[PDB]
């Protein structure tokens, strides 16, 4: 139970701060630890016994503990420290045991709004042939990677049968999503049109697929 | 100029038990602690318990207490974290980390780089590869897009390659889907010229480990 903010912004060359917040029988009686982590790999420790920065780690990291909370610090921020940020200490009532924070997550500003690129593909003719139906809509390329998706039969929404994913980042820094629609042949079939619609930063991108016309 | 380095990903049933090692260089017999995190997806770090060097007694957490077990051979510089009686809620990341110095209340300077347990009521089915094909709805600005869906396969990960390897710039596979099923699909896409497509022969190398099925399929218009 030790409780951070859940995220924390700034441009880069600027300084940050990351607050913890703990009672007496944690942060108030034992040192705090900070480690981050960015994704996909193992957390490194960042900062050690309150205030102390262990061999191998930049200067710009700097550790902080009064009374009952602790703050980390990082200062001349490069893009390559956006990564989720945890507070760790020892519990010295009678649980006895290792607790760590929520984590927060720092983000860096500043990258160009991306317009999204959308791909939709119809269910190919070998699966509808196995007596099943997939609609397929592949969103790449956009920032920042928020998107929401909605379908459509026809004219008219349809919320049946619908699978979306968390959006991703890729490779190049900019996000990814898919959205899967399942349906029957005799459904598939039995429409004029599909749409799979976008939206994304207050303006809409939408692809349309028919029963091969 | 000492590593530490968990055992494979496992995939679990409701019920059954689960027993992941950590092998440490350097050592090998120990004079450090070693402890057991997990981490649930999108959660903050969660302590389950360490075991003391030398006097080997254990520590753990409250809410494991009872179903986790923690032990090491020393004569090989390996420790076992065991958990019983799972539930869905087990799924996480599971890190094995030492600390700098012999005590579990003390910070943990090194980390392995983790390892999954799935906790799952479905059993391992291998995919079905669909071609994603062209045609004109994709062909703009002399690109086109093209595709393969690899639909209910258990469990992950899958593998997807183009052209036995040689087509790599120019090519996405997106993260999969888990369906209400249980069961995993992913797509991955591969964009080109407009001009090569009818020339040109495109093949995607799909590979389930899991399920020893490997699945070659032309994708074409």
């Known amino acids: 139970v030790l409780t951070q903010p859940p995220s924390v912004s700034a441009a880069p060359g600027q300084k940050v701060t990351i607050s913890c917040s703990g009672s007496?029988?944690?942060?108030?009686?034992?040192?705090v630890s900070w480690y981050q982590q960015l994704p996909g790999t193992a957390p490194k420790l960042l900062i050690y016994d309150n205030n102390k920065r262990p061999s191998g780690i930049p200067d710009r990291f700097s550790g902080s503990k009064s009374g009952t909370s602790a703050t980390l610090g990082i200062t001349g921020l490069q893009t390559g420290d956006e990564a989720d940020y945890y507070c760790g200490t020892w519990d010295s009532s009678l649980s006895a045991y290792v607790v760590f924070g929520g984590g927060t997550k720092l983000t860096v500003l500043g990258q160009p709004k991306a317009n999204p690129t959308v791909t939709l593909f119809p269910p190919s003719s070998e699966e509808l042939q196995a007596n099943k139906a997939t609609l397929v809509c592949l969103i790449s390329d956009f920032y920042p990677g928020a998107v929401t998706v909605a379908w459509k039969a026809d004219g008219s929404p349809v919320k049946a049968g619908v699978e979306t994913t968390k959006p991703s980042k890729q490779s190049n820094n900019k996000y990814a999503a898919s959205s899967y629609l399942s349906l029957t042949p005799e459904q598939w079939k039995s429409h004029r049109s599909y749409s799979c619609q976008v939206t994304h930063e207050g303006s809409t991108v939408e692809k349309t697929v028919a029963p091969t016309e | 100029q000492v590593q530490l380095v968990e055992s494979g990903a496992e995939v679990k049933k409701p019920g059954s038990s689960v027993k992941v090692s950590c092998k440490a260089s350097?050592?090998?017999?120990?004079?450090?602690?070693i402890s057991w995190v997990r981490q649930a997806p999108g959660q903050g770090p969660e302590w389950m318990g360490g075991?003391?060097?030398?006097?080997?007694?254990?520590k753990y957490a409250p809410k494991f207490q009872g179903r986790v077990t923690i032990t090491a051979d020393d004569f090989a510089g390996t420790v076992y974290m065991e958990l019983s009686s799972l539930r869905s809620e087990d799924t996480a990341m599971y890190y094995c980390?030492?600390?700098?110095?012999?005590?579990?209340?003390?910070?943990?300077?090194?980390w392995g780089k983790g390892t999954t347990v799935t906790v799952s009521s479905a059993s391992t089915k291998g995919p079905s590869v669909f071609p994603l094909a062209p045609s004109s709805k994709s062909t703009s600005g002399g690109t086109a897009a093209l595709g393969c869906l690899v639909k209910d396969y258990f469990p992950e990960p899958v593998t997807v390659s183009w052209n036995s390897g040689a087509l790599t710039s120019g090519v996405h596979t997106f993260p999969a889907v888990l369906q209400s099923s249980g069961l995993y699909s992913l797509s991955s896409v591969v964009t080109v010229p407009s001009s090569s497509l009818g020339t040109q022969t495109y093949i995607c190398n799909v590979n389930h480990k899991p399920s020893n099925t490997k699945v070659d399929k032309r994708v074409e218009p």
């Open positions: 075991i003391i060097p030398i006097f080997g007694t254990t």
């Open positions: 007496s029988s944690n942060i108030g009686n034992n040192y």
């Open positions: 980390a030492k600390h700098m110095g012999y005590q579990v209340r003390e910070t943990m300077d090194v």
């Open positions: 350097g050592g090998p017999f120990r004079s450090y602690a």
